[PDB]
Design a protein around this ligand. Structure first.
Ligand SMILES: O=C(O)[C@@](O)(C[C@@H](O)[C@@H](O)[C@H](O)[C@H](O)COP(=O)(O)O)OP(=O)(O)O
Ligand SMILES: O=C(O)[C@@](O)(C[C@@H](O)[C@@H](O)[C@H](O)[C@H](O)COP(=O)(O)O)OP(=O)(O)O
Ligand SMILES: O=P(O)(O)OC[C@@H](O)[C@@H](O)[C@H](O)CO
Ligand SMILES: O=P(O)(O)OC[C@@H](O)[C@@H](O)[C@H](O)CO
Lengths: 255, 263, 255, 263
């Protein structure tokens, strides 16, 4: 079934994760035809500034995420940044996320594959759609069974990303495709007004899921604030994508 | 508001080709009564890559052939001009005057189209940012245009490739009705050397995206036998596939419409 | 010999043209190994705003340019925008300039070629280097003998142009290559600090000439003000490009 | 200030290859005494497109082979790290620690390199704007780096293509010494499918442009027989051509130097 990955960008506190986890659990009950996956980063390892929020560490992170998986029975997903983090993270994360800048780091992908968990690779902003074929092959080589590719925009001049929707059907040839509705409209080094419109485009085109970051108070997010979707808007957007998908799916091309 | 479907052969290869496509468009206009159809065909391909490629049979012949289509089928007409002097004679048959993408900044061409009293449709240049169309519309309004359209047809993305930045649809809607060009947005500029390339397998999904995002119309070239087209062959849509494509966009538009953001 | 095209962007007045013409005449006398060509537009036919300066018309324009060619004996070049302007302009213009946005308009190129004059086509910001081969062929077909291709930047995301110096050697395969040092750093819809550095790059790479706009008081230019090179800086830059060329020319690749 | 020339085989295919290239670099360092040479070679290609491409013989072997080059020829050494833990052992031989382009934003890798006391050279990511390197340098300074380099190696320009925006040289010079990567800037990312492509015919002219604009050094990969390289073959420069290229950049640099803008 259709996949919806959502949660706060960073693990600002397990308190925050439980508040978002509650709303995602609720939505999960209201939309049984959808498989929800809770997402949150235990570390922002690639901030532009040394003076920005990174997180509370992997320890506190896996701890807080475990609390969500136990308290709400929601699947879990978080990103890793170096090979050694694959094993400890695999303890709670149902899906291991590979950062976009790291989509080509062979050992990170192999370490993720080895854990036996599912792997979701964010397509680098420098990568062409067809070049993801090799990414998938590395994961298969590493023993990966559940592989996802996430579209999150492509470099378009400076401090700007454009979403080439031709990548959805192209990447679908070798993996399940997820659309990152949040970071695809962010401006490197974002504009919330384009999140919903492009989400609609992604489902009209055809994808296996949507990646969507949410926060009680977006403007207060310690990371990616100008892109955080308000918690209260999640339901409406999900209902919207399901309806569009239902009608459009009739025309999705055969693999 | 009535959705707009602009369609037709890329070039006026012959009056016969036009009448053949016109008949089908007419048939579709009878079925899809909630759609406003506009028959399109260029009397001249004035910007081919090669001096050896097909251009057309002249403005006179073209206007004559177009008039025949309007008389025989009662369809609105649209064609593009390349120099100011063509605006007047073209306005005698064209309901919508189209401005080529490379020429979207040529002040006199725009002014010439605007003073005819006809509607004007400007193809957004591959070099233009979405927010830069605000001045294009201002020029037209200044020149007297009352019905203005802006057509999205892709943006330069590296060499011989175009990308469609769907953020442009809601941006351009701030000052004009927006049209999505389903065939040229997947075209590969001069990708074939003396001719341009194209990827027909992406035409349909990108069109679905366009209507899901929200636009006021779609523009699509069609031809009985695409591979025989004298121009844009790699992008021409098989005439028999037009009905299904249209039904699909109307369905996707209906279900997505309640979510279209207010400008 | 090496070509230097210079002058004010627009014909703000024949007075302005005579003041710049005097300095270019002087430079022409000081650098005999260089062929100078006076440039100025009788109309800015593609301004973004309807409320901006266009010019005084073709009449007043050809008039003022004729005054420069007679008073200083300097060759002339100006751009045309529609086919009918080729003939009247060919009366004074030694080189007919084709605007970048119009580099693919067949009739404009043919009308220019027919006049017998030399033709300089500005490479469209949407065009690939190799795609200029066809541009040249149209001109040859039209009877052109002296054909130039000018590099003026390529679309790089929004409101930004990047100069791909690989285009110089590629275009040199079928025509003489001129480098537009002024508009190559302008931001569509500019930064003067990059004009000189990239001019140096162009000659180090290898080109047949440089296109350079100048004005007594750049900030007062009615068009392209943020890019107009100060008249007083022309000499130093020319001397600089000649010295770099002299040393680098030893390594220019064979066609 | 002494111009920097960083050169060597792309990968440590074998200690033999290294000693063969090292001998030549050593010979050149004796001739071009006004140049500071740094021998380069990766102990591991950790970001190949295909899982089937050559990677190397391990960090231990690589560091061993590099140390041999430094001992036998007295040449400075530089190699790149891929994870934080590699910084320490690599710092035992490397005079300059290189940070891969895709990893230019990985805070811990940068911090790991900085605390070794060694010089740090960051390849500017193909996704990074020139002005965005200001924070990269700040991170390094924060982590204790006293000698920092920023290397220009091209920017994403459409798919499978890189363009060099020379405006970046004077921009990055505002906060660090700038190095121009003559071989990877003309590389075609994954242009060959399971491998990347490249256009060797542009290496030389772009290098001339780099020195004419103004930089503090050039980085160039070389190999006795480029077409036999186990990686970056389409871009490796023939070892015998190194001397002439270097002489040329020194000549162009000298004549252009009086015009370099002051930062
Ligand atoms: O899902 C994610 O967490 C993330 O989008 C990573 C993203 O959160 C960060 O890259 C974030 O955009 C970045 O750290 C912001 O940097 P600034 O310091 O605000 O410029 O995955 P990616 O690898 O696609 O970037
Ligand atoms: O040499 C030229 O005159 C010109 O560079 C034309 C150039 O002067 C104009 O295009 C100018 O940049 C433009 O009119 C400025 O538009 P604004 O209205 O300031 O946005 O030739 P091109 O065809 O390469 O643009
Ligand atoms: O096939 P070439 O000659 O490149 O020209 C194609 C164009 O005519 C086509 O994209 C469209 O009709 C106008 O640009
Ligand atoms: O040839 P593939 O496998 O695409 O990788 C090439 C890269 O290793 C090369 O550009 C460089 O060594 C690092 O990116």
């Amino acid at each position: 079934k259709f996949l919806v990955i959502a949660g706060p960008n960073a693990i600002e506190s397990e308190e925050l994760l439980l508040k978002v986890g509650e709303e995602i659990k609720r939505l999960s009950e209201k939309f049984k035809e959808v498989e929800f996956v809770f997402k949150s980063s235990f570390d922002k390892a690639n901030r532009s500034s040394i003076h920005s929020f990174r997180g509370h560490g992997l320890e506190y992170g896996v701890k807080a995420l475990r609390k969500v998986k136990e308290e709400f029975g929601l699947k879990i997903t978080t990103d890793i940044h170096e090979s050694w983090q694959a094993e400890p993270v695999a303890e709670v994360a149902d899906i291991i996320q590979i950062p976009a800048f790291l989509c080509r780091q062979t050992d990170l992908l192999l370490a993720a594959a080895k854990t036996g968990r599912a792997v979701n690779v964010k397509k680098g902003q420098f990568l062409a759609p067809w070049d993801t074929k090799n990414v998938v092959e590395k994961l298969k080589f590493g023993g990966a069974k559940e592989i996802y590719l996430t579209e999150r925009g492509t470099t378009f001049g400076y401090n700007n990303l454009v979403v080439d929707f031709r990548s959805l059907p192209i990447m679908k040839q070798w993996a399940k495709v997820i659309y990152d509705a949040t970071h695809s409209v962010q401006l490197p080094g974002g504009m919330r007004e384009f999140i919903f419109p492009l989400i609609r485009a992604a489902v009209a085109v055809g994808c296996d899921g949507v990646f969507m970051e949410t926060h009680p108070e977006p403007e207060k997010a310690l990371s990616d604030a100008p892109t955080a979707l308000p918690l209260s808007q999640l339901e409406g957007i999900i209902e919207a994508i399901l309806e569009i998908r239902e009608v459009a799916s009739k025309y999705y091309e055969t693999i």
